Design a protein around this ligand. Structure first.
Ligand code: SF4
Ligand code: SF3
Length: 543
């Protein structure tokens, strides 16, 4: 039989599924606990949805449990079985209490009713509630496409909540959609509808996080970021959470410890509020997947605010700190997932005992082209399109990863004619943001809008251009979409773009294993989704 089944990321074995051990390092009992956690979270969603329909209140603490549970099961987020098992217990306790306040308990699912306190009972239940519990290929495909989209949505909703923003309609949708994925009566048409609705609420979640980030730290602006290093001890902050960075910068003031960013923390440099801390140094290294080498050479402690964390080498494991929903057995954790005060005193003391970073490279990279900054430049962008100086934009946003085939994205970028502009967001950027690609009329040929969530800015920019040019269809803009994906935040970004009517998206380096033949056919027929081949062939064909 199979010890596990997981197919949620781009690197899944054979582009079919991980059945023994995850390519990411996820062990079968860890995979089982995540399957059990998702199951009881869907049960909680049903109960909460029923309470809302009865006219009864559901406290925001329930919303936070749901988003934390989903985020903990994203690829490279949490490998800690003790933490995962305790989240299962907490969820069982919470949903039992909520169900007791229902007037009518009729029609509650097994997920709503089932509970366990012993890990052994959780592992046994997991075996019959995983991916392959749904027998029909199309229903399975759509249920898990939706679930993965909801994980990405929940991540963005959680970062907004950390910064003090939440919307009842967003949390209500997430919980109702989760419940619908266990309802056997829904047709394929119902589930295709729910997939597109999930994309729409993906836009809403990204809009909420955009407002939270910019409202707190200012609108991103054009910024030069040092990729070399200084000579003081440092802490390297990775992942996505800007509130964790704020607290870390405040606590390192006056200490002699510098702060550097990694991977998806690069865009923190673009926000005006963070420029006021003199000990906020550069961005160190590249995307998440190089971290076994780059965390080693950094020498100082590393703080993971979100995914992606890879199972650490023994050489630096003792200086890895996790926080929020991130976890790895044997790595120190700083508690907190709601933006509350976190005590970084131990990581700061640790940093003072470590060597300064070993430099990988020197120079700079430019970014900060989020929606406010690009709309301020809109007249000049529009003039350049009208004159033919800019012939095409290419959206190359998304996720990077390990696959050797991803040299495609570097070669594609290098081979583009010098009258094109790359638009990016997310760690996919690292395949081409240290090339020397130049500028068109002073506009850089790579425009970095920020984190994967700042794909929102790219959509806002596209819709603005549609308006100014007076076009009926967003697809009539001179934009090619060549997006790379790895984890579930890329899935919500994709669904968001589809909900906005974007066609002709080229997705790679492979297509998700969780798209069944019939579901893929709908995406091809209605949205013209395609894949990649060689960079030289696609540089001809895509244009
Ligand atoms: S998260 Fe990806 S690599 Fe890890 S077990 Fe799942 S499909 Fe496999
Ligand atoms: Fe926020 S984009 Fe998706 S892969 Fe892991 S950090 Fe990267």
């Amino acid at each position: 039989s199979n010890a596990m089944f997981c197919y949620q990321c781009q690197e899944t074995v054979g582009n079919k599924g991980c059945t023994q051990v995850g390519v990411c390092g996820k062990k079968p009992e860890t995979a089982a606990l995540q399957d059990a956690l998702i199951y009881v979270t869907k049960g909680l969603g049903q109960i909460a949805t029923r309470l809302r329909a009865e006219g009864k209140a559901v406290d925001h603490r329930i919303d936070r449990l749901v988003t934390g549970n989903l985020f903990a099961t994203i690829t490279n987020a949490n490998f800690d079985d003790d933490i995962l098992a305790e989240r299962v217990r907490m969820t069982c306790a919470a949903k039992k209490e909520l169900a007791a306040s229902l007037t009518d308990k009729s029609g509650l699912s097994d997920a709503a009713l089932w509970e366990a306190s012993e890990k052994s009972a959780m592992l046994a239940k997991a075996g019959t509630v995983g991916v392959m519990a749904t027998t029909d290929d199309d229903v399975r495909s759509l249920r898990w496409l939706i679930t993965f989209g909801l994980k990405g949505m929940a991540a963005y909703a959680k970062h907004a909540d950390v910064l003090g923003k939440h919307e009842n309609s967003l949390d209500a949708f997430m919980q109702e959609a989760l419940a619908k994925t266990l309802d056997d009566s829904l047709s394929v048409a119902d589930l295709v509808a729910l997939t597109l609705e999930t994309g729409k609420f993906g836009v809403s979640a990204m809009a909420l996080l955009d407002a939270a980030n910019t409202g707190t730290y200012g609108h991103p602006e054009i910024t030069k970021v040092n990729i070399g290093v200084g000579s003081n001890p440092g802490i390297l902050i990775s992942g996505h959470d800007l509130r964790d960075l704020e607290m870390l910068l405040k606590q390192t003031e006056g200490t002699g410890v510098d702060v550097y960013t990694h991977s998806e923390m690069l865009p923190a440099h673009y926000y005006p509020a963070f420029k006021k801390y003199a000990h906020f140094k550069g961005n160190y290294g590249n995307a998440w997947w190089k971290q076994k080498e780059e965390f080693e050479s950094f020498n100082g402690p590393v703080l993971l605010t979100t995914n992606c964390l890879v199972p650490p080498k023994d050489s630096y494991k003792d200086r890895v700190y996790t926080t929020g929903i991130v976890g790895f057995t044997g790595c120190k954790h700083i508690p907190g997932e709601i933006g509350e005060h976190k005590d970084f005193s131990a990581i700061i003391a640790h940093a003072k005992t470590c060597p300064a970073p070993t430099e990988i490279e020197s120079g700079e990279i430019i970014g900060g082209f989020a929606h406010n900054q690009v709309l301020a430049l809109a007249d000049k962008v529009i003039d350049a399109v009208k004159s033919g100086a800019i012939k095409k934009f290419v959206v190359m946003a998304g996720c990077d990863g390990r696959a050797k085939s991803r040299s495609y994205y570097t070669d594609f970028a290098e081979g583009l004619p010098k009258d094109t502009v790359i638009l990016t967001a997310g760690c996919a950027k690292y395949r081409y943001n240290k090339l020397n690609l130049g500028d068109i009329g002073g506009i850089p040929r790579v425009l970095d809008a920020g984190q994967c969530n700042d794909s929102y800015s790219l959509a806002v920019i596209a819709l603005k251009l549609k308006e100014v040019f007076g076009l009926e269809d967003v697809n009539d803009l001179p934009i090619v979409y060549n997006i790379a994906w790895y984890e579930q935040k890329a899935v919500i970004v994709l669904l968001a773009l589809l909900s906005l009517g974007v066609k002709n998206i080229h997705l790679g380096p492979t297509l998700p294993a969780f798209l069944s033949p019939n579901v893929a056919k709908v995406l091809v027929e209605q949205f013209n989704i395609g894949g990649i081949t060689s960079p030289q062939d696609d540089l001809k064909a895509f244009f």
